[PDB]
Structure 1
Amino acid sequence: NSNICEVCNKWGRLFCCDTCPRSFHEHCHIPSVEANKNPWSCIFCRIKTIQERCPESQSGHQESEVLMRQMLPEEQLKCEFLLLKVYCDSKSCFFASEPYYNREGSQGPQKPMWLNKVKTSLNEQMYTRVEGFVQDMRLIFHNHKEFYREDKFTRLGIQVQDIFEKNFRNIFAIQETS
């Protein structure tokens, strides 16, 4: 097994996957690493199994059909993995915790949003369709772009949004286009 957390790239108290060489801090894994379960398989392994069981699940999909899917166990899992892929980027620190807004010339968003809030919402099964989760994720970056205006810090929202969108297209096998 790796000697650093796959998500935050630090050492510490690490739980090791039984079916691959990744390791995780308890609350870096999504869902939080399960109490018992020997053997234990990480989210990466669980996602790969879904693909292996149904190879056709990788054929292209329309985003509009994906968003309307109900949050059954497989879709729940895929949103957890997509959330985890965003936390994997170090720039996710800017979007993880509850923000506050006091900048000359800007007003804060009407509906603030942050990663840890999306994490809790997933854990609490508050999303009934994929659309709920994706809307909150895209709202994080949209709020950031609007608040920071022409400050160059706006670019952090572009960058982390791009990580989200690339992983959304991969995980949900969105049809490739020009």
Structure 2
Amino acid sequence: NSNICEVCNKWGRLFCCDTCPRSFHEHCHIPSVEANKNPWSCIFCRIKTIQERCPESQSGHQESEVLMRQMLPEEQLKCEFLLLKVYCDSKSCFFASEPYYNREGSQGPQKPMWLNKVKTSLNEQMYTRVEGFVQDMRLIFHNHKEFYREDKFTRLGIQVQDIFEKNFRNIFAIQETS
């Protein structure tokens, strides 16, 4: 097994995957690493199993169809993995915790949003469709772009949104386009 957490790249109290060499901090894994379960399989392994059981699940899909899917267990897992892939980027620190807004010439967003809030919402099964989760994720970056206007800090939102979107297209097998 790896000697650093797959998400945050730090050592510490790590839980080891039984079916792959990845390791995790308890609350870096999503969902939080389960108490018992020997063997234990991480989210990466669980996603790979989905694809192996149903190879046709990798044929291209329309985003509009994906978004209307109900959050059954497989879609729940896929959203958890997509959230985890965003946390894997170090630039996610800027969007993890509850933001505050006091900048000359800007007004804060009407609906603030952050990664830890999405994390809790997923944990508490508050999203009924994939669209719920994706809307809150995209709102994180949209709020950031609007607030930071022409400050170059706006680019952090662009960068983390790009990681989100690339991973969304990969995990949900969105049909490739030009």
Tell me the CA shift for residue 40 of structure 1: 0.1
Tell me the CA shift for residue 149 of structure 1: 0.1
Tell me the CA shift for residue 125 of structure 1: 0.0
Q: Runs of 5+ in structure 2 lacking a partner?
A: none
The residue aligned with 1:82 is 82
Tell me the CA shift for residue 116 of structure 1: 0.0
SS in 1 for 2:15: strand
Distance 1:171 1:117 in 2: 21
TM-score by length of 2: 1.00
Tell me the CA shift for residue 61 of structure 1: 0.0
How big is the alpha-carbon RMSD for the aligned residues of Structure 1 and Structure 2? 0.1
The residue aligned with 1:47 is 47
Tell me the CA shift for residue 96 of structure 1: 0.1
Q: Runs of 5+ in structure 1 lacking a partner?
A: none
The residue aligned with 1:122 is 122
Distance 1:156 1:33 in 2: 29
Tell me the CA shift for residue 160 of structure 1: 0.0
Tell me the CA shift for residue 64 of structure 1: 0.1
Moved over 4 A (4+): none
Distance 2:35 2:126 in 1: 23
* TM-superposition CA deviations, 1:65-102 (whole Å, max 9, x none): 00000000000000000000000000000000000000
TM-score by length of 1: 1.00
Tell me the CA shift for residue 134 of structure 1: 0.1
Distance 1:5 1:18 in 2: 15
* TM-superposition CA deviations, 1:126-169 (whole Å, max 9, x none): 00000000000000000000000000000000000000000000
Tell me the CA shift for residue 105 of structure 1: 0.1
Distance 2:144 2:8 in 1: 23
